[PDB]
Structure formats: C-alpha cells, structure tokens
Paper text:
The PhoD family of extra-cytoplasmic phosphodiesterases are among the most commonly occurring bacterial phosphatases. The archetype of the family is Bacillus subtilis PhoD. This enzyme is a phosphodiesterase but also has significant phosphomonoesterase activity. The physiological role of PhoD is proposed to be the release of phosphate from cell wall teichoic acids under conditions of phosphate starvation.
The structure of PhoD was determined to a resolution of 2 Å via a multi-wavelength anomalous diffraction experiment using the iron cofactor as the source of the anomalous signal. The core of the PhoD structure is a sandwich of two long β-sheets flanked by α-helices of varying lengths. Three active site metal ions are coordinated by residues on loops on one face of the β-sandwich and are covered by a long C-terminal helix. With the knowledge that PhoD contains Fe3+ and Ca2+ ions (above) anomalous Fourier maps at three wavelengths allowed the assignment of the three active site metal ions as one Fe3+ ion and two Ca2+ ions, which we label CaA and CaB. At the Fe3+ site the sole difference in amino acid ligand sets between PhoD and the PAPs is a cysteine-for-aspartate substitution in PhoD (Cys-180). Specifically, the CaA site has irregular 8-fold coordination with all amino acid ligation being provide by Asp residues. The CaB ion has regular octahedral ligation with Asp and Asn ligands. The C-terminal region of the B. subtilis PhoD protein forms an α-helix (residues 560–577), which lies over the active site. The C-terminal helix blocks access to the catalytic site. The main chain crystallographic B-factor for the C-terminal helix is high (49.1 Å2) relative to the whole protein average (28.2 Å2), showing that the C-terminal helix is more mobile than the rest of the PhoD structure.
Residue numbers in the entry: 1 to 522
Write the structure that this text describes.
Amino acid sequence: APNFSSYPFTLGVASGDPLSDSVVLWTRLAPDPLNGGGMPKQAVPVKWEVAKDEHFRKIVRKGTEMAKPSLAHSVHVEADGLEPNKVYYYRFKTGHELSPVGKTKTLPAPGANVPQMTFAFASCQQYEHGYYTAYKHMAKEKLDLVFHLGDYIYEYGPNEYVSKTGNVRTHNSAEIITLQDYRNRHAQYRSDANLKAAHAAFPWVVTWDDHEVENNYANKIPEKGQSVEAFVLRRAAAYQAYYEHMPLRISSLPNGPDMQLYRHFTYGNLASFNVLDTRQYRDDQANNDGNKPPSDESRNPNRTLLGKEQEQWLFNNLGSSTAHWNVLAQQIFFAKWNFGTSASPIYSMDSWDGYPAQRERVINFIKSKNLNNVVVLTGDVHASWASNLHVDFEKTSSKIFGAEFVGTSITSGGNGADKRADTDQILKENPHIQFFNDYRGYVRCTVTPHQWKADYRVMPFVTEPGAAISTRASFVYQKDQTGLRKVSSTTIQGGVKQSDEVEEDRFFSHNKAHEKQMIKKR
Ligand SMILES: [Ca+2]
Ligand SMILES: [Ca+2]
Ligand SMILES: [Fe+3]
Ligand code: NA
Ligand code: NA
Ligand code: NA
C-alpha cells in the first residue's frame, strides 16, 4: 500500500528487446525526477499486466516486481509466455497509482516467412539544442520497432556545447560525474512528453555511443588527456544509470564498468540484426582524434573497434545467417568519408575511417561469404547520408555488398539546412555517397525480401516546437550492382537552403564545450 504525494510515473513507460515469446517492460518510480526521484529508501511493489487489448479485459500475463532504491526504483520485467508477431498492451500499478498504457509487439517465430518489416532509427538528441518534435511525429508512425543508436543523453553542463541556432533549453546540472548526476540527466531527457510517447508506442532496441558517458571516450580512455582512473568510475556510474533507464534484459545488468550491450536477433527469416557496441572495447583514436590525415598510427592493423570477442561473434552471426538481410545497427560512419583530396586525404579518427584495419577485417569476411545483403545503420554525425558499400572502398567498379544509411540527429546541432558549405566537395571526392541532408529527424526503413527502402524523415527546425515532418528523400536497394536508387525527393518548406557549416564545426563545437568546462573551473 505505497502512497505517493505526486504521480510516480513521470518518466512514463517503455518496452524493448523483443523476442518471439517475450518482451522487456520498463518503468521507473520517480515522483520528483530531476532531484533524484523523491522516493524513500525502501523497496516498493509494482504490479504489471500484459493484455491483448487496450482496455485490459484480455490479460495474458501479470506479476509483481519489487522496485529497489539501489536501481533508482526502476522496473524491468521480462514478460514471457507470449505469442509471436503479436501486438500487446501493458501497464503498471503501484499502490493505487496507474502508469500510462504502453503498446508493444513480439518478434515473428524464428525462421517465419515474414513479407515486410517497418522500423525507425534515431540518434543524437541534445536536449538543449531543440524540442523533440521528431518523436511526436515518430509516435504516429506504424512501426514494428525502433532502434536508438546513441547519444540518448549528453553529459555537459549548461552553455557548454552550444548549437549554432541557440541552446533553447538548458541542462539540469553541471557536467555529470556521479551515479546520481547520470540518473538525474536521464530523468531530464526522459521527462519530455514526446520521447515518452515514442517509448509507449513501440518496443525499442537501444545501443549507446559516447555521450551516454562522455564525449569521444574509447574503452577506458577519456578525451583530452583526462584521468583514466576517474573515468572508470564515471563509466560504471553512466552504465548503471543507462541500464536503470532502458528496457534491457537481465544479461545486460552491469558489473562495475562492464556491461553486455552488443546482441543479436532475427526478424523471422527476413532480417538478422547485429546490434554493435563500438565504444566499450575500442582502442584509442589515432592522431589525437579529430579529422586528420591517415598515418601509420591510424593504419596499425592491431587496432580494434569491436574487440576480439565481439568481432568473432559478429563473424559467426554473419557467416551462419540465412536471412534475406544482414544488418549492422551501430554508431559511427562506416563508409569511406574523405574530407581532403586523393593526394592529401583527411579522415574522421573517431569513425570507421579511423580504424581502417578493423573495417578491412569486416569487409574481408563479408567478401569471403559472398554477401550482398548487408545494411549498416549509423548515427553520430548529426546529418543524413547514404552510401553504396563496395567490396573495395577505393573502386566504384567493385562489387556492391550493401548500403549504409546514416541518420541525422533528433536535435543535436540545431535547425541545420538542406546543404552545407562542404557538401559538393565531399560528394565529389566520395562518389559512393548518394545523399546528404542537414535537417533534424529520423530514418524510417521498410524491408521486404528483395528490397530495402529508407525514408529520411525531417523537419525544417527544432528551436521552436511544432515543425511539420516530410520525407526529404527515399532510397531503395535491391541487391544488385546498381546499388541505391532515389525513388523520392522533396524540398522542405521553411528550411534554410544552404548554410556555411562544414563537418569540422562539430569537432570545433565539442572542443569549445570542453574549453568552457575548464574555464568554469576558473
Ligand atoms: Ca563525440
Ligand atoms: Ca556520438
Ligand atoms: Fe551526437
Ligand atoms: Na581518445
Ligand atoms: Na599495436
Ligand atoms: Na568533459
């Protein structure tokens, strides 16, 4: 009989990591969410129900979990005994308090011959840079699931990482360090009504990038020559807070600074999804990070992004898959992405171009199995791109093994534009690249056995609430040497047409943030 002085489900509900017979259900009791949750230091019973209908007359599964202080009174339920490829509704009750109703959906039975799948993927939602209008629109989509590919939170204090179009909202605290700091930052982001609606609408498959801990971290090495010892404690705090706020299974429970997040599942026989973790195990960025010429350092063949175990696990999944599609749901730019010239190349040291030997091992394995059904989903870069993936990244004449869809950010970077100052140059230098756009939004994918379609769903602005969404462009890939085909293209009403931004602005703006952090320590 817990009683509350304020409505406890301030962060809503969520579901995730669906399998054919179960799904994770999530909530958190947080009546005062930005001040640590406002809960007493005792375990609180939370009842849960799963039904076939939204009025809960046809309940199929129910139980009681004990929400505990040591996990910020979060609740993770693995609701099993469910049927495959079926929509369910779920809700929680604590004392007399009722959560919002959530909607979810189990996967098809393994090997089921499913004709179609629709999903969206998102990344990069800097709270200060704009409103979450993208998620208002996403919540109205008809999707089987959603992927989040990282930067679900950012770690900064206020007035540090400042958008070109202004910081319209403000982080709740100084730069986040402790478990409580991370919990409160997750609560700030998750309090947004639009994000909560998108969570209540679909099951999510999440994976993190850098800003869930700190900018451009690499395994246990923080950026800018900061302390490794302090960073390891910080990673443990960040990983715990992430678990507490995400609909993950119990095998993802962290143990100190370590946490199993990479994982695999198949959507019938249509698509095999490898959800990667390119932060937790990676070697340090070469050449002091940033955008630099390649070097013996960056080209060192021992350097890894995935780590040895994840690499082998991935090869095992790719080699044994009989699905129509093999998908890498991951964080960072995979295709060749030269910012310089052929003679004097310049590459992102934090992207796959910074880890070329690791990329070679993945491509060589894909070549060895003769695959041409590989799709890579990406975030991080705060703009939309699409590329044909060739078995030799230097030869457009080489065989196309797949495609990469790089999604823009939900908000990071501000209102943006259709085109930037360096767009024509980069496209010229990188002819495998078929698309650039710099408006905020997300990517919607529709998959059938012989065709993959990606729609880029974008808005003219995020600095004010209420922008309309449109499909800027749509591409289809059909597993042949013609690669990506543009099937739609529309100009965005009310959007800036061309800015003077260049890719280096993202690195520069993150470095200005760090400088401001240092100045604040006087
Ligand atoms: Ca970064
Ligand atoms: Ca990132
Ligand atoms: Fe980001
Ligand atoms: Na580094
Ligand atoms: Na080495
Ligand atoms: Na920092």
